Each structure stands twice: as structure tokens, then as C-alpha cells.
Design a protein around this ligand. Sequence first.
Ligand SMILES: NC(=O)c1ccc[n+]([C@@H]2O[C@H](COP(=O)([O-])OP(=O)(O)OC[C@H]3O[C@@H](n4cnc5c(N)ncnc54)[C@H](OP(=O)(O)O)[C@@H]3O)[C@@H](O)[C@H]2O)c1
Ligand SMILES: CCC(CC)[C@H]1c2ccccc2CNN1C(=O)/C=C/c1cc(Cc2cnc(N)nc2N)cc(OC)c1OC
Length: 162
Amino acid sequence: TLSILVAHDLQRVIGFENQLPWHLPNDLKHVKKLSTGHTLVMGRKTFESIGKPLPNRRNVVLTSDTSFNVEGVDVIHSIEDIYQLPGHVFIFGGQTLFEEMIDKVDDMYITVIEGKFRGDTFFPPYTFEDWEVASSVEGKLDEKNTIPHTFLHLIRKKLVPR
Ligand SMILES: NC(=O)c1ccc[n+]([C@@H]2O[C@H](COP(=O)([O-])OP(=O)(O)OC[C@H]3O[C@@H](n4cnc5c(N)ncnc54)[C@H](OP(=O)(O)O)[C@@H]3O)[C@@H](O)[C@H]2O)c1
Ligand SMILES: CCC(CC)[C@H]1c2ccccc2CNN1C(=O)/C=C/c1cc(Cc2cnc(N)nc2N)cc(OC)c1OC
């Protein structure tokens, strides 16, 4: 199974200066819950932003850099390598990987950040005409999580006659 995992705001901003534009601990917990025991595939810039592999999942980094070798990280050099990965694979970011993969994935786990942030990187446009809402869950707000957000699980719709 191949999924996208992403947080984007009302204008599909996902990043600014190689960081998340928002501080939202619950979304990172959401991410942890979904991906534990599975595989993350991420672009090189996304990896460098995080700075270390996330524990208790397979960390796969896509890069053209043949010198890339980081302890606890598997490296691939082509999109086509993604399909050889076993198990449940999450496309983890960033913009380049989402653009390359949005037409290929089975489904998407999207956190809609219900705000408008300054960004320099974006999730590609998509339409709910093509995507069934398997679930939509409002994130709970508290002292440490102050931005309204919604967890979407979207599944690609089949093209059928009439
Ligand atoms: N909000 C979210 O859910 C979320 C999630 C993840 C990331 N982000 C944000 O996204 C932004 C980064 O996105 P980005 O597009 O600038 O960078 P990125 O996708 O994280 O990484 C880009 C790099 O990935 C490698 N790559 C991508 N496609 C490749 C291919 N077909 N073959 C070989 N290598 C390939 C290249 O590495 P080399 O240049 O080393 O070859 C490329 O320069 C940051 O702002 C980050 O904070 C947001
Ligand atoms: C530190 C708290 C948490 C969970 C307690 C911590 C963690 C700790 C232990 C075990 C697992 C995990 C999983 N997570 N962490 C991270 O430290 C990584 C976050 C992260 C993640 C992304 C990609 C991303 C974010 N959000 C959504 N919805 N989709 C995505 N693909 C980008 C980023 O910076 C561009 C990130 O660094 C901010």
C-alpha cells in the first residue's frame, strides 16, 4: 500500500524556509501514530530539516547524491525504487515528492491546517471530485495546540462508466 502523508494549510502551503510553518504537536503525534512500524519515503531536503531518522519506522531518503549515507537511513536514487519497498509506504514530503507521487498513490492522510501561513512550498492542487473522504476528524484544541485542524483520510475514486 502506498499513501501520501501531509499537512497543508487553507492555501496548500506545506513549508517555509525548510521548516513547517506551524507549531502543532498533535499533528506530529498523528504522524507518529500512523507511520510507526511502517516506511517513510522523503526527499533529501525534508530529511535534512528533521535532521535525524525517526525511530521505529523505516526511513528512506530519495536523493541524487551517491555519497549520501546516514546511519539508520536507507537511500534510494529514483522514484521507481519506491515500488520495490515492501509493506505500507508513506510519501512523507516534501513538495517535489508530493508532486511526483500524487498521481500514483492509493490514498492520502491529510491534516488540513485551518489557517493561512506564509509559505514557499506547496502541496499540489487536487479535487474532492477525484477523492472519497474515508474519514474527516476535527483535531482537538488545547493549551499547546491552538490552530484548528482536520484529519482527512482520502481514497482515490475509481473511474467508472456513467
Ligand atoms: N507540511 C508537510 O506535511 C511537509 C512534509 C514534508 C516536508 N515539508 C516541507 O516541504 C519543504 C521541502 O520540499 P522540497 O520540494 O523543497 O524538498 P524535498 O522534496 O524535501 O527534497 C527535494 C530533494 O529530494 C530529492 N529528489 C526528489 N525527487 C527526486 C528524484 N526523482 N530522483 C532523485 N532525487 C530526488 C532531491 O535531492 P538531491 O538534491 O539531494 O538530489 C531533491 O533536491 C520544506 O519546507 C519542508 O518543511 C512539509
Ligand atoms: C517530535 C514529536 C514527534 C512525535 C512525538 C516526532 C516523533 C518522535 C518519535 C517517533 C516518531 C515521531 C514522528 N514525528 N516527529 C518529528 O519530530 C518529525 C516531524 C516532522 C514531520 C514532517 C513531515 C510531515 C509532518 N506532518 C504531516 N501531517 N505530514 C508529514 N509528512 C516534516 C517536518 O519538517 C519539515 C518535521 O519536523 C518538524
